[PDB]
């Protein structure tokens, strides 16, 4: 509710004590914070925050500003820059502290930290952070809250289990979190003075030497700064190296892009660290026997094993038929590409790859099929597709799907081959995979059925509904069959919603109602015309 | 990960200087925090959390216990206590602080406070708790980042608008 408005001093001191540890493992309320923290720009902002029972967001940040300095001797100078915001957004090169008022107006007499919750910002990957942290913060907590509150005990409200389900939808729905950010490389996050000295010592074209750095070649502080910069760079490249999109929750396009991105990035970094600056930096730090940095760089590559992990190029061998599929607009080309990609998949056997990842990629391929073939059939415009042409195009699509099914079966055979390989290490072998298209095909196949019957329902009207070939019932039933045909023809088409099939089933059960009216009429004419004898026009 | 690991002493002392500023709004570490220091089960669970990268979540539940009373007509007093939680649980009449590694790898040299991500929870109502907090957390920040980072111009992941709808329906259900 609305209560006494807190003062600047109390919360200011609180946050001042809280920040420096959270920001740089200490600092003890730096004056750079307090300068614009005490500024009227922030002061009136926070007065409004405390007073207004409508604003519950605030963002205090402190960017370690990368102040570019043009003076010769170095490249950049580390800087401190406190930042005040009333709204929250991704701060760049800085972590921030958000504060949400749990009470629309907050006072000091009750605990301020009780009436307001703290958030702290991640600059590395804020989206992946917020996702994972919200998950691990609420989902087990919410489940425990449901269990202890007995929401399952009182079924009058069943919306809390559904919101648990939608929380699950959130967490497992997005894991990529816009993964694969395409960070190919960065600048050089090391000591600037050595970089500029080597740059000026080589632009002269005279092979930067050990001595031209002066005592800095053996300066313990200089060498330690070199080690710190090298460690920063190695940590960055390890971070970007360990990145790996989950095979699920993505798409085959995502996988191929991920593969190519990592390929080109590993190329450019295997060509980047060989710059003479890095080499001379390592040499002159080791000149003072800085062996820890040397062994770290030797071992903290973290890319070699990734290099052999990507050394398989049957990936691209499947990727090209994937591109053909994406460009595919006709069924024949579609299962041509299917055959080619399956062949390349059989060719992946000699290469090493995560088996579960491969299975997930196969499933991704399967429903990517589902999607693109849905686009193709919608292009075919089955909404009012004529009878015989519908049958022809459906036979084509269904035999293409049978080709896919054979590919699926031979893929199961390849999976058995994969289990034969697994015999070398004997890890988990759980197998389960199901493209959604089957359900689609489900509707497809059942539509064929009505088409059949409708054909049979036409010529016979000229035969059996015609009087010995009454006229009133004949006319009524031909009118009904025509109108029912029209309604069932235009009721659904390329529509792939299964509930659409169900509505179509209602329409066709009404169709069959008229049809049974016809059956009654024709049987009545039968029996009333019977009784004569067996021969021909009698029975 | 485990290459260098922060010590029990330094992390626990940081927590001891940090918690009272929050659960007392600037107070000093009480005997409950002393027991937290001395709690051997906590002393091992925090070591597990710091060491094991399998779980990056930890919780401390400064618990209020219904202390029995012998007063002359005065209802039972409340006694502040402590609890350690590798997992998280529906705290009741027991305030909580959650610490989940923003940096999954663990390093003593790395600022542990800047290696950790900090949340908290006071027991008023979980419904409004979750609703309001996710609202004023991800509504402005997420939308601002997606709009301003050029991702709204990038077709690589049309996943963002879908999860925006997901967030909106989250807030609807929670409110």
Q: Three-state DSSP class for A329?
A: coil
| Chain breaks of chain A after residues with C–N above 2.5 Å | 469
A163 neighbors A145 (Cβ within 8 angstroms): no
Separation CA A461–CA A445 (nearest Å): 26
B4 at A interface, C-beta within 8 A: no
Please give the DSSP secondary-structure letter assigned to residue A300: T
Please give the DSSP secondary-structure letter assigned to residue B77: P
User: Out of B26, B103, B117, whose CB is closest to A120?
Assistant: B117
- Would you tell me how many other CB atoms lie within 10 Å of the CB of residue B103? 19
Separation CA B96–CA A140 (nearest Å): 14
Count of residues in chain A = 539
Tokens 């079966």 belong to A409
Q: Which residues pair with A96 in a beta bridge?
A: A61
Closest by CA to B105, choosing from A124, A284, A506, is: A124
Separation CA A249–CA A268 (nearest Å): 28
Separation CA B83–CA A296 (nearest Å): 40
Q: Are A167 and B170 an interchain contact pair (Cβ–Cβ within 8 Å)? A: yes
Q: Express the helix, strand and coil content of chain A in percent, nearest 5 each.
A: 65, 5, 30
Please provide residue A494's backbone torsions phi and psi, each rounded to the nearest 5 degrees: -55, -15
Separation CA A258–CA A263 (nearest Å): 8
Please give the DSSP secondary-structure letter assigned to residue B117: E
Chain B environment of A110 (Cβ under 8 Å)? 25
> Nearest 5 degrees, angle CA A530-CA A534-CA A536?
90
Please provide residue A88's backbone torsions phi and psi, each rounded to the nearest 5 degrees: -110, 135
B18 at A interface, C-beta within 8 A: yes
Q: Three-state DSSP class for B19?
A: coil
B63 neighbors B39 (Cβ within 8 angstroms): no
A345 neighbors A318 (Cβ within 8 angstroms): yes
Closest by CA to A516, choosing from A528, A508, A506, A527, is: A508
Separation CA B158–CA A248 (nearest Å): 16
Q: Which two tokens stand for residue A106?
A: 């907050």
Closest residue in chain A to residue B120, using alpha carbons only:
A117
Q: Which residues lie below 8 Å from residue A260, measured CB to CB, with a gap of 6+?
A: none
Task: Name the minimum distance, in Å, from the CA of A276 to any CA of chain B.
Answer: 29
Separation CA A538–CA B12 (nearest Å): 103
Measured CA distances, B38 to B9, B48, B75, B94 (Å): 11, 16, 30, 19
Measured CA distances, A306 to A234, A240, A425, A460 (Å): 15, 12, 20, 70
Separation CA A448–CA A454 (nearest Å): 10
Q: Which two tokens stand for residue A498?
A: 């299964």
B156 neighbors B116 (Cβ within 8 angstroms): no
Q: Three-state DSSP class for B73?
A: coil
Closest by CA to B64, choosing from B95, B18, B24, is: B95
Closest by CA to B80, choosing from B27, B14, B15, B10, is: B27
Chain A environment of B144 (Cβ under 8 Å)? 87-90
Q: Which long-range contacts (CB under 8 A, 24 or more apart) does A425-434 make?
A: A428/A356, A431/A359, A433/A359, A433/A362, A433/A363, A433/A366, A434/A363
Measured CA distances, A238 to A185, A273, A279, A296 (Å): 12, 13, 19, 11
Separation CA B118–CA B48 (nearest Å): 18
- Best A93, A114, A174 member to test B by mutation, with max B CBs in 10 Å, is A114
Q: Which two tokens stand for residue A311?
A: 């050394």
Separation CA A246–CA A230 (nearest Å): 30
User: Could you tell me where the beta strands, DSSP code E, fall in B2-143?
Assistant: 57-66, 78-80, 84-85, 94-100, 117-121
Please give the DSSP secondary-structure letter assigned to residue A60: E
Q: Which residues pair with B65 in a beta bridge?
A: B79
Q: Three-state DSSP class for B119?
A: strand
Using CA atoms of A470, A475, A476, A479 in order, give the dihedral in degrees to the nearest 10: 150
| A57 exposure class (CB count in 10 Å sphere: 0-12, 13-18, 19+) | buried
Separation CA B61–CA B99 (nearest Å): 11
Closest residue in chain B to residue A88, using alpha carbons only:
B141
A13 neighbors A22 (Cβ within 8 angstroms): no
Q: How many CB pairs under 8 A join A and B?
A: 172
Residues of B numbered 71-130 whose beta carbons fall under 8 angstroms of chain A's beta carbons: which are they?
Answer: 87-90, 92, 95, 98, 100, 102-103, 111-114, 117-122, 124, 126, 129-130
Q: Three-state DSSP class for A514?
A: helix
Burial A140-171 (b: 16+ CB within 10 A, else e): bbbebbbeeeebeeeeeeeebeebbebbebbb
> Nearest 5 degrees, angle CA A377-CA A380-CA A385?
110
Q: Which two tokens stand for residue B65?
A: 């216990």
Tokens 């199961």 belong to A412
Alpha helices by DSSP H, A271-330: 276-287, 291-299, 304-310, 314-327
Chain B environment of A95 (Cβ under 8 Å)? 114
Report helix angle B31-38 to B40-51, nearest 10.
70
- Would you tell me how many other CB atoms lie within 10 Å of the CB of residue B167? 17
Q: Are A133 and B119 an interchain contact pair (Cβ–Cβ within 8 Å)? A: yes
B97 neighbors B59 (Cβ within 8 angstroms): yes
User: Could you tell me where the beta strands, DSSP code E, fall in A156-273?
Assistant: none
Q: Are B22 and A147 an interchain contact pair (Cβ–Cβ within 8 Å)? A: no
Closest residue in chain B to residue A158, using alpha carbons only:
B173
Q: Are A141 and B90 an interchain contact pair (Cβ–Cβ within 8 Å)? A: yes
Sign of the four-CA dihedral A27, A31, A32, A33: positive
Please give the DSSP secondary-structure letter assigned to residue A158: -
């Amino acid at each position: 509710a609305v209560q006494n408005v807190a003062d600047v001093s109390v919360l200011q001191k609180h946050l001042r004590k809280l920040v420096p540890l959270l920001l740089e493992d200490g600092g003890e309320a730096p004056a750079a914070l307090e300068a614009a923290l005490e500024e009227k720009s922030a002061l009136e902002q926070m007065r409004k925050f405390l007073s207004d029972p409508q604003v519950h967001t605030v963002l205090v940040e402190r960017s370690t500003l990368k102040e570019d300095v043009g003076d010769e001797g170095e490249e950049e100078k580390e800087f401190i820059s406190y930042n005040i915001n009333i709204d929250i957004h991704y701060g760049v090169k800085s972590n921030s502290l958000a504060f949400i008022k749990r009470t629309p107006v907050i006072d000091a007499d009750k605990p301020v930290s009780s009436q307001l919750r703290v958030l702290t910002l991640s600059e590395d990957s804020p989206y992946e952070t917020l996702h994972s942290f919200i998950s691990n913060a609420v989902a087990p907590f919410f489940k425990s809250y449901i269990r202890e509150s007995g929401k399952a005990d009182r079924d009058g409200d069943k919306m809390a289990p559904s919101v648990e389900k939608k929380i699950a939808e959130l967490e497992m729905g997005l894991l990529h979190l816009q993964q694969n950010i395409e960070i190919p490389e960065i600048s050089l996050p090391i000591h600037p003075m050595i970089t500029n000295v080597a740059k000026q010592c080589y632009e002269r074209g005279e092979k930067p030497k050990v001595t031209d750095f002066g005592d800095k070649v053996e300066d313990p502080t200089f060498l330690n700064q070199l080690q710190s910069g090298v460690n920063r760079w190695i940590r960055e490249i390890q971070k970007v190296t360990k990145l790996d999109r989950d095979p699920a929750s993505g798409t085959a396009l995502q996988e191929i892009s991920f593969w190519l991105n990592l390929e080109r990035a590993l190329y450019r970094i295997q060509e980047k660290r060989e710059s003479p600056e890095v080499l001379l930096t390592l040499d002159i730090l080791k000149h003072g026997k800085r062996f820890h940095a040397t062994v770290s760089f030797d071992t903290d590559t973290g890319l070699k094993q990734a290099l052999e992990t990507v050394n398989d190029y049957n990936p691209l061998m499947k990727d090209f038929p994937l591109n053909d599929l994406l460009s595919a607009t006709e069924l024949d080309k579609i299962r041509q590409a299917l055959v080619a990609i399956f062949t390349h998949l059989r060719k992946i056997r000699n290469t090493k790859y995560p088996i579960q990842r491969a299975l997930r990629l196969v499933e991704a391929i399967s429903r990517d099929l589902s999607s693109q073939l849905l686009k193709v059939l919608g292009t075919r415009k089955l909404m009012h597709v004529a009878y015989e042409e519908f049958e022809k195009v459906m036979v084509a699509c269904f035999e293409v799907f049978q080709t896919w099914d054979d590919e699926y079966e031979k893929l199961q055979v390849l999976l058995r081959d994969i289990v034969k390989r697994k015999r070398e290490e004997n890890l988990k072998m759980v197998w389960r995979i199901n493209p959604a298209h089957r359900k689609l095909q489900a509707r497809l196949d059942q539509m064929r059925k009505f088409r059949r019957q409708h054909e049979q329902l036409r010529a016979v009207i000229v035969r059996v509904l015609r009087p010995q070939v009454f006229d009133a019932a004949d006319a009524n039933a031909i009118e009904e069959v025509n109108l029912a045909y029209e309604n069932v023809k235009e009721v659904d088409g390329l529509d792939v919603s299964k509930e659409g099939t169900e509505a179509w089933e209602a329409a066709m059960k009404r169709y069959d109602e008229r049809i049974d009216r016809v059956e009654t009429r024709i049987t009545a004419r039968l029996r009333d015309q019977l009784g004569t004898a067996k021969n021909a026009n009698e029975m």
